[PDB]
Every structure is written in C-alpha cells, then in structure tokens.
C-alpha cells in the first residue's frame, strides 16, 4: 500500500497509513521505515513525535539509542540531552520492572557520558557515573564502563583511585576460585598494602594467613609476619611455630628475655 502511494506522491495518505499501522504495534521494521519516511519528508517535528511513541512500543536501548543517533546526527544540543535525560530517568523509575539488563543499561550510561565529554563538560559526565553506580550497585559492566571513560578523560589520580577497586574484585574472585596460588597472594596483599591502607589492610593479612602449608606457602606467612612486624607479634609467632620443637624451646628460653623480638622471630 505504501510504495503505490509513494509513487503517487500522496504524502498525507502514507502518513495516515503509518499512523494506523504503527497503532497495531507491529514490530521494529515498521517504525524504522516510518522514521525513514519523515526524513524523506523533512518533517523534523513529526519524526521526533514518532520516537516518543516508538520507545513506548519497544522499550529497549537500541530504540532509545536510535533516537540519540538521530539527534546527534543533527547536532541540536538542547534537544539531545533532553532525550538523554528522559532515557536515564525512565530506566531509574521503572527499575522494579526488570526489563533492561546489566549489559543493556551500560550502553545508555556510556553513550550518555561520552556524549557529554564531547560537549566539554567532564563534571557532568563524571557525576552521572557515581549516581549510576549508586543507583545500580549490581552491574559490574557499568562499573567497568566507568573505568574506560576515566582512562580517556579523567586525571591520573582518579584513574588510580578506580583502577585499585577493579584489581581488588578480580584478585578476590580468583582467590575464591583458585585455592593455593601463592604468587597472587603476594600481589593481593601488596595491592592492599600499597593503595588500600585501612582496617581491610590488617584484615586481609589475617585472611591470607588463614589460607596459609607448602614451602611455597610458608614464605607468605613470613611476609605477613613482616607486614605485622613493620606495622601480639610474639603471640601469633608461637601459634604458627606450633606446626613442629624441643631444641627450639630450649633455644627460645635462652634467647627471648636475654637478648629481642627479632631474636624471637629468628627461632621461627
């Protein structure tokens, strides 16, 4: 019905066809041919009305992001962020419906943020990342998609603040999976001793020594010994040296109170 009325140049009749045919909710092939019709007719106010309905026929990001590729083709900055504001609020308020996946919402946040970086406003592009990660703490891809922007567009301390957390989670999920890989323990502790000095810094050294029996193992407890010693210390030393020690206790009693703690750790 269309291409005949196209061939007659009756543009009001295909428009009345399209309005009826898009009222029956037919599918993505129809609306895409209908937004391609109004591009042919140059009716920019009419095609903006279509995507208003088209996201409400097909709520999914490749229909929202198709409407942002429309606006960013035209460079109208005032309309483009208004589309962006409507897209991210709709995901927020309709959160409980669970109709946009974790990979699906990462594309909206990134394509919002990389657009704002091109608009030279890094502070809004940075601020929405913190709101999106607090609104969705569940999705890791938004947290990962929040790193690649800072690598592109943020200052070097802010990357180093964020690069430490991703190394924290990935080192944690390998150590939960792989039981005894002691070369990753010697980096995971030094990931935390370098860039995470906190109560977690002491706690992981407890948790690493919890996992700590091989020759490949007992040198890691020596590292956590020195991590504790550099900063009780004799108390954990006697609990660990209980693996077995008659000659050691005779060596302990001669050089513990007489000489130091370093002499006490020398028996271990």
């Amino acid at each position: 019905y269309l291409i005949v009325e196209e061939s007659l140049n009756n543009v009001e009749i295909v428009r009345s066809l399209y309005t009826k045919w898009c009222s029956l909710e037919p599918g993505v092939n129809a609306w895409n041919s209908f937004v391609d019709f109004e591009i042919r007719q140059k009716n920019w106010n009419g095609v903006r009305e279509i995507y208003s309905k088209y996201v409400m026929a097909h709520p999914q990001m490749q229909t929202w992001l198709k409407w942002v590729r429309f606006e960013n083709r035209h460079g109208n900055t005032e309309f483009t962020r208004s589309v962006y504001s409507l897209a991210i609020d709709t995901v927020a308020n309709l959160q409980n419906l669970q109709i946009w996946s974790d990979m699906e919402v990462a594309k909206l946040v990134n394509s919002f943020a990389h657009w704002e970086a091109a608009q030279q406003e890094y502070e809004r592009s940075s601020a929405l990342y913190q709101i999106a990660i607090e609104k969705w703490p569940s999705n890791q891809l938004l947290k990962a998609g929040l790193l690649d922007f800072e690598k592109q567009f943020g200052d070097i301390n802010s990357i180093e603040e964020t690069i430490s957390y991703k190394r924290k989670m990935e080192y944690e999920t390998i150590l939960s999976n792989n039981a005894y890989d002691y070369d990753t323990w010697w980096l995971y502790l030094d990931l935390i001793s370098e860039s995470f000095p906190k109560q977690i810094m002491q706690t992981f050294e407890k948790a690493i020594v919890d996992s700590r029996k091989e020759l490949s193992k007992n040198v890691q407890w020596k590292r956590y010994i020195y991590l504790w010693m550099r900063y009780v210390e004799l108390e954990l030393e006697n609990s660990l040296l209980e693996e077995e020690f008659q000659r050691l206790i005779d060596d302990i009693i001669p050089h513990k109170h007489f000489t130091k703690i370093w002499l006490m750790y020398a028996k271990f």
């Binding site: 269309l2 291409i3 196209e6 061939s7 007659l8 009001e12 009749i13 092939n29 041919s33 042919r40």
Partner: protein, 102 residues
C-alpha cells in the same frame, strides 16, 4: 547465513523500490487531495494522470525484467548440466533438485 524471512525481504524490496523511486525523481529534476462525498460515504482522490502511468509502466517493466531473467536462467539451466542420463527436461530438472539437496 540462512534464508531471508518474508518480513526482511518485504522491507528490502520496499527499500529498493524507494531507491528506484528516488532516482526517478532525481532524473526528472535533472531533465528539466481528498474529497469525501455527501450523498454516499464514497471518497474521491484527485490524481495526476502522470505517476499513475509511471507506476503502471514500472510494474510492467519490472515484470518484463524478472520474466527475461528467469527465461535466461531457463536457458542456462538446460544448457549447463549433461553428465547424468535423463529422459526429458523434467528428469534433469528433478535431478538438479537432488543435486541441490546434497
């Protein structure tokens, strides 16, 4: 890979007719209503005599091109294969069908 579904092929042939229609309007540029009845519910649309002829000629010409494309494909299909013994054209036709199944 796969075949093309009748929704996509309807869209692609829709686009091809749009591109061809656009090139007709471009070539016409280079070379240079609705009334409803009161008595009945019948509706009347004012049309130019052109673009009705142009649509009818185009549909005939597209039918001619597809007819001669298939006819030349008929010519190739009965001149290519001659290995297997047959009896008629319909034998070779059906045994081309068994070769397509392999």
């Amino acid at each position: 890979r796969g075949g093309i579904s009748y929704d996509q092929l309807a869209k692609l042939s829709y686009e091809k007719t749009l591109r061809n229609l656009a090139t007709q309007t471009q070539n016409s540029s280079k070379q240079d209503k609705v009334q409803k009845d009161t008595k009945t519910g019948k509706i009347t649309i004012a049309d130019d005599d052109k673009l009705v002829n142009k649509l009818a000629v185009s549909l005939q010409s597209e039918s001619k091109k597809r007819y001669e494309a298939r006819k030349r494909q008929m010519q190739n299909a009965k001149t290519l294969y001659g290995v297997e013994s047959f009896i008629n054209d319909k034998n070779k036709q059906f045994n081309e069908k068994l070769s397509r199944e392999s």
